Amino acid sequence: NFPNSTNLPRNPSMADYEARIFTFGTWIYSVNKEQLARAGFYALGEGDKVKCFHCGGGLTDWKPSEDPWEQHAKWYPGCKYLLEQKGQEYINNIHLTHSLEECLVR
Amino acid sequence: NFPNSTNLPRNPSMADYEARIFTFGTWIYSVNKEQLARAGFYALGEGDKVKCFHCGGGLTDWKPSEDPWEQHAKWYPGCKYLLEQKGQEYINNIHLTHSLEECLVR
Numbered sequence: 001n002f003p004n005s006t007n008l009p010r011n012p013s014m015a016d017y018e019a020r021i022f023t024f025g026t027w028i029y030s031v032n033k034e035q036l037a038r039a040g041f042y043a044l045g046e047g048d049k050v051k052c053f054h055c056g057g058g059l060t061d062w063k064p065s066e067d068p069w070e071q072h073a074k075w076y077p078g079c080k081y082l083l084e085q086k087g088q089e090y091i092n093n094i095h096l097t098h099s100l101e102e103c104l105v106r
Numbered sequence: 107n108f109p110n111s112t113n114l115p116r117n118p119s120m121a122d123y124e125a126r127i128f129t130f131g132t133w134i135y136s137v138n139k140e141q142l143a144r145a146g147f148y149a150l151g152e153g154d155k156v157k158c159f160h161c162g163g164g165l166t167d168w169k170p171s172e173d174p175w176e177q178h179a180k181w182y183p184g185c186k187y188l189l190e191q192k193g194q195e196y197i198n199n200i201h202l203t204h205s206l207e208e209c210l211v212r
């Protein structure tokens with residue numbers, strides 16, 4: 001499935017913070033589930049797999065120091081929800097940061 | 107001379123837009139002198155040498171598509187005047203952009 005770059009959430013039932021927060025249950029993984037819900041993610045129930053209610057993008061293997069919003073932007077730049085909560089400034093900063101990181105190592 | 111990263115302009119007499127704009131005279135160079143004055147620069151009177159009234163930083167060899175604020179940030183990141191007119195968001199964007207550029211080529 002391709003990313004929903006529409007202004008309409010792909011998964012309306014997970015549009016409310018609360019709704020998302022509930023899908024987690026006892027969260028044992030490194031990243032805070034509150035942060036995840038705010039960043040728009042709800043849990044799938046297998047490993048640390050989360051999915052954005054709006055663009056539908058998914059992430060896993062959440063490392064210690066890895067940020068929800070940061071990753072959200074990194075992998076689902078077209079997500080409108082992301083755009084609504086952070087604005088393009090933030091988003092570009094993150095994309096420049098990531099690309100520069102990949103370059104520094106290269 | 108080192109860059110003035112103080113909140114007090116190094117050259118108070120050039121603190122007013124008008125004051126700066128006047129130092130140019132007939133400007134023949136590529137970059138717009140209005141843009142330059144806004145970015146805080148006043149002309150020295152030799153080639154396209156300009157200097158920030160606040161941090162005192164200087165630039166020359168103004169190329170066709172080269173921006174005052176962009177360059178100001180590139181070479182005088184510590185300038186408080188710069189910080190006051192653009193905010194850190196903008197400034198980081200520019201620094202990430204420049205560094206990533208230097209990396210892409212490398």
Ligand SMILES: C[C@H](N)c1nc(C(=O)N2CCC[C@H]2C(=O)N[C@@H](Cc2c[nH]c3ccccc23)C(=O)O)co1
Nearest residue numbers: 044049050051057058059060061062063066071075
């Ligand atoms: C933040 C973390 N380090 C991180 N995760 C990811 C990440 O999952 N990505 C990057 C874009 C693609 C995705 C990924 O590989 N998923 C795999 C496996 C998978 C199948 N169903 C789901 C549902 C939810 C998450 C993953 C997943 C795929 O084939 O779709 C990048 O950084």
Ligand SMILES: C[C@H](N)c1nc(C(=O)N2CCC[C@H]2C(=O)N[C@@H](Cc2c[nH]c3ccccc23)C(=O)O)co1
Nearest residue numbers: 150155156157163164165166167168169172177181
């Ligand atoms: C925007 C343009 N491409 C550009 N200019 C510059 C630029 O001048 N720099 C970068 C930081 C240092 C400065 C520079 O080299 N000046 C020379 C020559 C010089 C002597 N007196 C003055 C007064 C005003 C400007 C230059 C200058 C130096 O030794 O101080 C970078 O990009």
Ligand SMILES: [Zn+2]
Nearest residue numbers: 052054055079
């Ligand atoms: Zn999303």
Ligand SMILES: [Zn+2]
Nearest residue numbers: 158160161185
């Ligand atoms: Zn300055």
